Design a binder for this molecule. Structure first.
Ligand SMILES: *[C@@H]1O[C@H](CO)[C@@H](O[C@@H]2O[C@H](CO)[C@@H](O[C@@H]3O[C@H](CO[C@H]4O[C@H](CO[C@H]5O[C@H](CO)[C@@H](O)[C@H](O)[C@@H]5O)[C@@H](O)[C@H](O)[C@@H]4O)[C@@H](O)[C@H](O)[C@@H]3O)[C@H](O)[C@H]2NC(C)=O)[C@H](O)[C@H]1NC(C)=O
Ligand SMILES: *[C@@H]1O[C@H](CO)[C@@H](O[C@@H]2O[C@H](CO)[C@@H](O[C@@H]3O[C@H](CO)[C@@H](O)[C@H](O)[C@@H]3O)[C@H](O)[C@H]2NC(C)=O)[C@H](O)[C@H]1NC(C)=O
Lengths: 222, 216
């Protein structure tokens, strides 16, 4: 197995609330490495949050989170955890699990991160509706056809989109989310494919909105 | 008491094949205790370089680092398309192990003018059943970035009922794509026939219109 770190747990939380993040480690003997949580807040650079020794015998915290956050690990199930309490506006961030290379407090393997959104605003967690953008005579030119998926009315961020479980990447454009007047986000993802292909190939957009546990696989037909 | 890491500039444009130099300053002397990370949107941060100058395994040799004390430098000898990214330094010397704010390397595209391919998508039947109609206009793979979309419904210019988004610049051909969505209630959608996306762009001698007639 290849080295992989996969964070999960991020979503919407009210100020003063609690949230637990998890990080699943594989492809290396987890119990031999110290582990860190690092975050990136809007308008800020990366920020070290906490670390834990390989044996879990020591744990340290950034001043801003001390007494609110607890790091821990499960050296048998190969998981790293971050328990957050009394969450604040400034804790909104992408949270990364990262492996300490040699114990020198720099990190050679990171996950893609999980996004924590602290909000006192009115919008509540909502999974998206996924609608096809069907290829037609109005979306074809020069022997190629555009098709896609419209991912409408979700909150908080993020949505990810793959095509054909990640086997279709060429010619994909997944657009940044837009904020609607409702306070909900929308995005679209499109792909350009051969016009000749539409009779035999299957195009499925795989939509993941982890904050609402929403997972949709929408087949897009002509 | 915390060591502050700073970076300059916060962004820069550079062309493929050029030599790139970005710098990182520590508010206190930290010998050679500096790392460089590469960040791309949605992707895991990647260790490039540690102890100022040691390349991480698998990092291309066009990357090198130098410095000592409070001044450090990341150099790319010949910038490649995959190198457009944000680069952050980090000290492992003391206390809170702190990162610079990041420097974003962007394209200085000397690219040919390319008009967008313009496509239009009526609302799906499933959406219409739920009482809402979103019409999508797609402008694909154009350069330069400036592009104007106007929505027209039975030739009446729309305002306030659309949103748009542009992709990150493509590192391999400098182009952009743009998605615009016009959203109406189903009742309003059914009061009209011609739905049109009108596009202005440097690559076009006059605005191009892409349209459909509702339910045809
Ligand atoms: C911040 O991070 C720096 C590293 O960037 C930490 O500095 C290290 O501190 C440790 C303390 O445990 C030193 O460990 C000692 O190393 C002795 C051997 O040193 C020699 O070998 C090292 C390893 O060489 C191999 O790997 C390098 C890649 O790193 C290759 O370039 C080589 O070719 C080899 O393949 C060399 O790096 C080093 O320069 C020497 O040549 C060992 O015998 C001792 O018993 C002890 O383990 C380590 O030397 C320091 N490394 C550096 C580069 O300074 C620092 O502690 C960190 N600070 C904090 C707070 O975490
Ligand atoms: C996890 O976080 C803690 C907190 O920053 C790190 O502890 C720090 O570890 C370094 C190096 O092991 C210590 O540096 C040493 O300090 C003494 C001064 O007491 C100095 O004489 C030594 O030469 C060396 O510089 C540092 O003191 C220590 N900080 C604390 C508060 O204990 C730890 O390294 C991080 N990583 C891991 C894997 O635990």
């Amino acid at each position: 197995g290849e080295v992989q770190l996969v964070e999960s747990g991020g979503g919407l939380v009210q100020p003063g609330g609690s949230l637990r993040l998890s990080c699943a480690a594989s492809g290396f003997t987890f119990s031999s490495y110290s582990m860190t949580w690092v975050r990136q807040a809007p308008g800020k650079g990366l920020e070290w949050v906490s670390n834990i020794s390989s044996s879990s015998n020591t744990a340290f915290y950034a001043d801003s989170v001390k007494g609110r956050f607890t790091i821990s690990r499960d050296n048998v199930k190969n998981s790293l955890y971050l328990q957050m309490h009394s969450l604040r506006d400034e804790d909104t961030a992408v949270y990364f699990c990262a492996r300490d290379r040699n114990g020198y407090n720099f990190f050679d393997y990171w996950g893609q991160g999980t996004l924590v959104t602290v909000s006192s605003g009115t919008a509540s967690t909502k999974g998206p509706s996924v609608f096809p953008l069907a290829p037609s005579s109005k979306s074809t030119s020069g022997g190629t056809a555009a098709l896609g998926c419209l991912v409408k009315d979700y909150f908080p961020e993020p949505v990810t989109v793959s095509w054909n479980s990640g086997a279709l990447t060429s010619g994909v454009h997944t657009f940044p989310a837009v904020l609607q007047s409702s306070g909900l986000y929308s995005l679209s993802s499109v792909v350009t494919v051969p016009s000749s292909s539409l009779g035999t190939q299957t195009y499925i957009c795989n939509v993941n909105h982890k904050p609402s546990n929403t997972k949709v696989d929408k087949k897009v037909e002509p | 008491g915390d060591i502050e890491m700073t970076q300059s500039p916060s962004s820069l444009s550079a062309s493929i094949g050029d030599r790139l130099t970005i710098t990182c300053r520590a508010s206190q002397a930290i010998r050679e205790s500096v790392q460089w990370y590469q960040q791309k949107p949605g992707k895991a941060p990647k260790l490039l370089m540690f102890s100022t100058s040691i390349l991480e395994s698998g990092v291309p040799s066009r990357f090198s680092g130098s410095g000592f004390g409070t001044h450090f430098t990341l150099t790319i000898s010949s910038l490649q398309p995959e190198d457009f990214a944000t680069y952050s330094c980090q000290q492992n010397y003391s206390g809170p192990f702190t990162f610079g704010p990041g420097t974003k390397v962007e394209m200085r595209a000397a690219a040919t003018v390319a008009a967008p391919s313009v496509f239009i998508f009526p609302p799906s039947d499933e959406q219409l059943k739920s009482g809402t109609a979103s019409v999508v206009c797609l402008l694909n793979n154009f350069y330069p970035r400036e592009a104007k979309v106007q929505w027209k419904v039975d030739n009446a210019l729309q305002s306030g009922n659309s949103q748009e988004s542009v992709t990150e610049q493509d590192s391999k051909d400098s182009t952009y794509s743009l998605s615009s969505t016009l959203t109406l209630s189903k009742a309003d959608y059914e009061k009209h026939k011609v739905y049109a996306c009108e596009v202005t762009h440097q690559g076009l001698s006059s605005p191009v219109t892409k349209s459909f007639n509702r339910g045809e």
